[PDB]
Motif scaffolding. Structure first.
Motif, PDB file in Angstrom:
ATOM      1  N   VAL A   1       0.821  -1.204   0.000  1.00  0.00           N
ATOM      2  CA  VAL A   1       0.000   0.000   0.000  1.00  0.00           C
ATOM      3  C   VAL A   1       0.857   1.256   0.000  1.00  0.00           C
ATOM      4  O   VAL A   1       0.506   2.279  -0.600  1.00  0.00           O
ATOM      5  CB  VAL A   1      -0.965   0.015   1.171  1.00  0.00           C
ATOM      6  N   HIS A   2       1.965   1.183   0.707  1.00  0.00           N
ATOM      7  CA  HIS A   2       3.029   2.185   0.603  1.00  0.00           C
ATOM      8  C   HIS A   2       3.891   1.698  -0.522  1.00  0.00           C
ATOM      9  O   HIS A   2       4.448   0.627  -0.437  1.00  0.00           O
ATOM     10  CB  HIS A   2       3.819   2.274   1.938  1.00  0.00           C
ATOM     11  N   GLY A   3       4.029   2.468  -1.600  1.00  0.00           N
ATOM     12  CA  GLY A   3       4.539   1.919  -2.847  1.00  0.00           C
ATOM     13  C   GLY A   3       6.003   1.535  -2.898  1.00  0.00           C
ATOM     14  O   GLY A   3       6.387   0.757  -3.757  1.00  0.00           O
ATOM     15  N   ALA A   4       6.813   2.098  -2.001  1.00  0.00           N
ATOM     16  CA  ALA A   4       8.229   1.756  -1.892  1.00  0.00           C
ATOM     17  C   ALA A   4       8.442   0.461  -1.142  1.00  0.00           C
ATOM     18  O   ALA A   4       9.523  -0.129  -1.170  1.00  0.00           O
ATOM     19  CB  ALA A   4       9.014   2.912  -1.140  1.00  0.00           C
ATOM     20  N   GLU A   5       7.411   0.031  -0.431  1.00  0.00           N
ATOM     21  CA  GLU A   5       7.518  -1.085   0.484  1.00  0.00           C
ATOM     22  C   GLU A   5       7.202  -2.383  -0.241  1.00  0.00           C
ATOM     23  O   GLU A   5       6.140  -2.983  -0.025  1.00  0.00           O
ATOM     24  CB  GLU A   5       6.613  -0.815   1.682  1.00  0.00           C
ATOM     25  N   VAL A   6       8.135  -2.782  -1.120  1.00  0.00           N
ATOM     26  CA  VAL A   6       7.887  -3.842  -2.086  1.00  0.00           C
ATOM     27  C   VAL A   6       8.130  -5.257  -1.560  1.00  0.00           C
ATOM     28  O   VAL A   6       7.625  -6.205  -2.186  1.00  0.00           O
ATOM     29  CB  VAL A   6       8.640  -3.626  -3.448  1.00  0.00           C
TER      30      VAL A   6
ATOM     31  N   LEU B   1       0.980  -6.126   5.099  1.00  0.00           N
ATOM     32  CA  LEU B   1       2.423  -6.246   4.974  1.00  0.00           C
ATOM     33  C   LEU B   1       3.088  -4.973   4.463  1.00  0.00           C
ATOM     34  O   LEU B   1       2.842  -4.527   3.339  1.00  0.00           O
ATOM     35  CB  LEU B   1       2.765  -7.379   4.013  1.00  0.00           C
ATOM     36  N   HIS B   2       3.948  -4.425   5.315  1.00  0.00           N
ATOM     37  CA  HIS B   2       4.665  -3.196   5.090  1.00  0.00           C
ATOM     38  C   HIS B   2       6.179  -3.426   5.241  1.00  0.00           C
ATOM     39  O   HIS B   2       6.624  -4.523   5.516  1.00  0.00           O
ATOM     40  CB  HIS B   2       4.212  -2.161   6.113  1.00  0.00           C
ATOM     41  N   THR B   3       6.974  -2.391   4.965  1.00  0.00           N
ATOM     42  CA  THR B   3       8.381  -2.359   5.369  1.00  0.00           C
ATOM     43  C   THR B   3       8.643  -1.010   6.025  1.00  0.00           C
ATOM     44  O   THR B   3       7.891  -0.066   5.839  1.00  0.00           O
ATOM     45  CB  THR B   3       9.385  -2.507   4.192  1.00  0.00           C
ATOM     46  N   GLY B   4       9.742  -0.909   6.749  1.00  0.00           N
ATOM     47  CA  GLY B   4      10.213   0.378   7.230  1.00  0.00           C
ATOM     48  C   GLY B   4      11.139   0.933   6.183  1.00  0.00           C
ATOM     49  O   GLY B   4      11.200   0.409   5.077  1.00  0.00           O
TER      50      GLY B   4
END
Ligand SMILES: [Zn+2]
Ligand SMILES: [Zn+2]
Ligand SMILES: [Zn+2]
Ligand SMILES: [Zn+2]
Lengths: 372, 372, 372, 372
Positions: free
Chosen positions: C43-48, C172-175
């Motif tokens: 959903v956060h586009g960099a968080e692939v 599911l995200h990333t920092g």
């Protein structure tokens, strides 16, 4: 019941797997005799008015008899068109690399002496047909280089492959805050009087990466070369870049005016059966070398005093610069003028600038195209 | 108690009236005999490691005897350095126009036959002095053209005016995700063994808008021309672009390694009194024409398998492309390799790409610089 | 031969007319008894990295017996994922408005006393079924408000409508530059030991616009209310946000580790038939109020000394700030430490910061989840 | 010879070490009796017209007798003002985080019952003085929290600390493509007739992070509370947000009109000695709840038919949407109207939109402020 056959062409691909596609509309010509046309808009993504021009043009074409094929490619750079930054389309260049989408076209570097030697025995029509096949194939070949090509080169090549098929190429653009103007090669200055465009820039035979140059240069080269072997004919292809007033704007009424001027030219060229007369208006031009960029001599907030499309006598104000950080001084407010007469064509779309930001482009040494 | 004299140079101006300034540090040479040096960093605003190199270099220089002038310009593009977009420095190009800051330097187009004819009577040293004065003045003259120059050209010109004063020019850059490499003109390949840089690109005599070329080309031209009149001497100026590993990174320990290699070169050139030996390491090179950009053959999410700075045998994977939009197919996951052996130098900083996005730059036809 | 049924959902539309779509994969459960699961990434586009997790998870699921429905939505924000700015995905927020995509979810504001009064006569299972139907419908209703809703709200609502159907929701995200961590509501802290995640943030019952909160809050509210009427049961829905190390990165091996931990949890919940044990590792947590953002106390260039995911004793350096503009002073280089012990979790992805830029987020008052 | 004393305030710091500063101009009042004023512009960096208003206002003030202190802060957000993206100022939000600069102000959360109990014995004037000291100090205290505060919070706090000192606060903004309008709290609707602003939004007592609310809410709270203890007085502070037509525009003539209306209000309040009458014009208002955002019901290219600042009867076209990708269908061109009468106030600055992009904001249930 539109006459247009609708298809689509894939020009690239996004990380999510979504195809980048361009819609293609084709009005089939009824005479294999007639010149064909390729018209595209919106390669610079903010420059959306060309889509309204295509819409008005196609609406008109439903009622004209089309003799030569007309191919229209609106929305020709979906990546650029869909690129937002704030309330503004960041559509001019690849957001990754900074490369201007309109500087990405392919220069064939044809060995002209050699190519001509191998094909001189052909008639003028056959020679032109062979030459066009070569321009299309070598363009298509760029798509399968083994280390690939850039996103922007792939876009440009796919568009160019279609443009090369046509006798007449119209690339529809807009300026920023801008009046209507046209880029016209020297050899085709005659054509400028058919469009509904007050100001024309006369460009030389020179490749700088743009669609119009990619399209006409090889043909200009072939013709000048053939003439040097005593074989005279006129350049078989025509290409023009139309600058349809301001970016970030759709105006259907204004687009209809532009479409009628385009039809005037297509009429004159026998692409359609009807006689459509050019609009009555004063038309002027300057050579490209006389079209000048004025850069901010200092940073500040800008009031654009000179109207685009109107003569500006030397000494009349072009801009006022406000420097509210210097209130109390003469430096707080400053009128800036130019030392020669000009016709300002376009100016910068924002009111805050740095030292060196482009403020205006202005034509100098302007003259009537069609003195009367 | 630093030996450096600190000053500053204005390179542009912001809309709020704030000056764009670059800090300048000068270590005066004690011998008018010795070659002078100009070192700059961070013209590309994300490429911040050069500032750490300058810091370590100046710290070391406090303890070495400086024979020739050393001028250091860290933080050389404040506009670019301060330009954020998300958690990333959008520092590579003018955010307004897309023009690459490192493509903005000035090509003098010296009429070399004429200039040389007017100054041939001078000794080699006097001729070099006259030529340098001309390069500085004509550069400075660009600052007062009456329609102005771009923001990027003004920056580039101000930096170049200082670079022209020096015998040795070092432009400090980084790659994206990148190993250490160097751009070295052909005539000065000898110098490559002094820096602590495993991979060197050997560049020809060609102007493409970069600081190194703007600095060396006129001198290369003068020398080749003089040699054609039977007057042999070696190119009086040296210029190098150092690529100090990855952008968006400061590493002081790694910067000290780089600074020691720079000192090795300055030592060899007699800029400092001490003998500082080059580091012991394997060093390789390739010609620029053999350094290749690999573009994504399709869009997707990317795993970078090949390590930067390590040989990659033909057929070993460069990247894997994940296409989670195509799960259920063979297309979901694909190893991509190259058909020849290479040394991958750098790769793209993001893991999502389009068709045509640059994935890697790789050297081919690599060889030892200093075979042993 | 995948077991997954593939479909797609339209979440918005681009100016060129191109649909914004999300691919949906469904593994049908064989028991109407079993809890269902909704898993989304990116959903956060960099968080692939979440896409690689979904890929490994689905690959594993081909060999496990699925008892409850599993729905996976990778590439869940195509607009954000495809948004580039330089060599970086500007994927966190709407580029037009600045609104964080993960702050766009819908808070139902259920009149809980009233709703419960109208449905108290139902069994616990029927009550949960009615409540879920209401959450789905009221969410879908947001799509047809007559003045419309924002681009980001439309995306969020379409995702949420699917999430509401499930018993278990994993976002599911990333920092940025980040170690693995988890956001877990207080009531479900038990679940944290099944994932392969060293650090868990224990969050309260509070709506701040995120997918996990949008999913669990209404159920948490219903349960606390029912308990106040002497009707005790445990919260029927579980929701977690996984932070899978760093953004702009795909690592399939690391993604497999994460997928195995997810399977450990799905096993424990009876979503699959097999017993899959959690990984053996030390696991810690802190309450959300103890998780702190450290802002740059001054601008400069940053070296990140403290490793993410490792304890940092009070007084040990967190960052060094380089200020090459102040060479000659003590201010040129400064170690910055914290006054209490912490576990740094993530830091800023660029090495140049302003005063106030977020440098790190660190956990304080950390404790073992599972003391042994 | 300006009467203004010029100073400057530091609001942040850039990575290169450059201070972010705001210029402050102060016209000292000659009577300690008179209300003081704080006027700022351009916190949203594209909204540059407020600087021209300040320039015209200060020019006028050179000839009026100033009774109360007037403090003016033009160019109040240098980071935002200087942030370019293409030919457009990306000035609305932090480019790193997306946080709106005008949502960053500090809410004091005053324990009003307690504070009032400790200070009730003071006269009305002394109570107001104590309360103002507290608002200034607690604001300043935010600057030294040990984990720091965000770049945007530091900016907002520094501005707010000055605003709190004044009796009258004017925050000068612009809309995008917009007519003149005003945000006015309910308690001060009387003041709206003095400004030269046709449309006023009447806002409630509610903190949403903006300068006007940060300034008036604590005073509104204190007054309503005191009234509940039988101590009646009118709210001692006035705050207004002026929306001075369109962004990215400087127009000195229009700015003079706005400055004259401001002077009308300052006159009425006894800040200056002269009687300056309000302009004669029709003035209208609506409650904030009746001011509505219309979102694009589908993506496309947009022609803005409804003029800003003019009534739009229900059923008259607001926009036309062009979808050139759908030529041949009725979907290619679509008039969009609204079901109720409205006054459109502003619209989106670009002509290409997504589904959900904000197209217009329109006032409904409009009425004359000053019926005559
Ligand atoms: Zn264009
Ligand atoms: Zn560089
Ligand atoms: Zn996230
Ligand atoms: Zn504003």
């Amino acid at each position: 019941m539109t006459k247009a056959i609708q298809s689509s062409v894939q020009v690239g691909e996004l990380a999510t797997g979504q195809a980048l596609t361009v819609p293609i509309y084709s009005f089939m010509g009824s005479e294999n005799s007639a010149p064909s046309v390729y018209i595209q808009a919106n390669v610079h993504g903010a420059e959306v008015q060309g889509n309204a021009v295509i819409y008005q043009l196609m609406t008109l074409l439903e009622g004209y008899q089309v003799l030569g094929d007309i191919t229209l490619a609106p929305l020709a750079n979906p990546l650029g068109i869909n690129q937002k930054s704030g309330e503004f389309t960041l559509g001019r260049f690849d957001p990754i690399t900074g490369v201007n989408w309109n500087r990405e076209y392919f220069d064939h570097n044809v060995d002209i002496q050699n190519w001509y030697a191998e094909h001189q025995h052909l008639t003028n029509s056959e020679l032109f047909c062979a030459y066009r096949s070569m321009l299309v194939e070598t363009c298509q070949a760029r798509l399968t280089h083994s280390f690939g090509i850039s996103t922007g080169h792939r876009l440009a090549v796919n568009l160019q492959a279609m443009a090369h098929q046509a006798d007449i190429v119209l690339d529809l653009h807009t300026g920023p805050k801008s009046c209507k103007h046209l880029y016209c090669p020297e050899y085709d200055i005659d054509a400028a009087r058919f469009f509904s465009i007050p100001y024309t820039l006369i460009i030389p035979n020179s490749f700088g990466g743009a669609m119009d140059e990619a399209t006409f240069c090889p043909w200009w080269q072939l013709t000048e070369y053939a003439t040097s072997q005593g074989r005279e004919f006129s350049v078989p292809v025509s290409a023009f870049t139309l600058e349809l007033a301001s970016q970030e704007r759709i105006d259907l009424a204004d687009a209809l005016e532009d479409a009628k001027g385009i039809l005037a030219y297509l009429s004159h060229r026998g692409v359609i059966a009807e006689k459509v007369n050019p609009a009555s208006m004063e038309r002027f031009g300057c050579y490209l070398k006389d079209y000048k960029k004025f850069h901010a001599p200092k940073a500040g907030l800008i009031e654009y005093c000179a109207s685009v499309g109107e003569p500006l006598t030397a000494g009349k104000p072009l801009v006022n610069i406000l420097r509210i950080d210097l209130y109390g001084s003469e430096q707080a407010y400053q009128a800036i003028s130019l030392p020669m007469d000009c016709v300002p064509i376009l100016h910068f779309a924002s009111a805050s600038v740095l030292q060196g930001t482009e403020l205006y482009k202005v034509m100098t040494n302007v003259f009537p195209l069609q003195p009367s």
